[PDB]
């Protein structure tokens, strides 16, 4: 996996992933 | 798997992923 | 899978992804 | 699976994905 | 599947996918 | 007026008010 | 105007008001 | 106007007001 | 207005105010 | 106008005010 981010005054958190087990967010 | 991310000004949490198994948001 | 995202001032929370299994949103 | 997203402020939650299997939102 | 998604200040929650098989909205 | 709101999961926009004058949804 | 709000993972948006006049959702 | 928010993991926006006049969601 | 605001791990943005004229969400 | 925040790991941006006139949140 490889990615670009971009955003502008974004207030809220961005999320962004990928899984193949359990996590908590 | 890759991907761009592009915003103005979300207040919001963005999420976005792939995911073979469990998870918790 | 791969991926473009733009938005303007969603408050809310964008939700994109591919499952093959379980998952907790 | 690929694809674009546009919006101007939904308040809203958006989802689009795919799934073989089970998934919990 | 690819696919692309307009809206203007939706409070709904959208969603669009495809399935095979099971599945928990 | 009052009131007390429970949901489980609704992917909906729920609304509910007073009006005693002109509105616009 | 008084009130209590419980949800659990709603993914759109509630909405709950009270109005007099206009108003643009 | 006074009021309670409760909620559980709402990828939604949650709105609750009052309005007398007109206002842009 | 006065207001109390509890939450657990809700991504989406919350909102509640009170209007007497115009705003833009 | 007075009030109390509480929150446990909200991603998202919280939003609360009051207004009389306009706004560009």
Not at 8 to 25: P, R
């Amino acid at each position: 996996a490889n990615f670009l981010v971009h955003s502008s005054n974004n207030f809220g958190a961005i999320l962004s992933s990928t899984n193949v087990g359990s996590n908590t967010y």
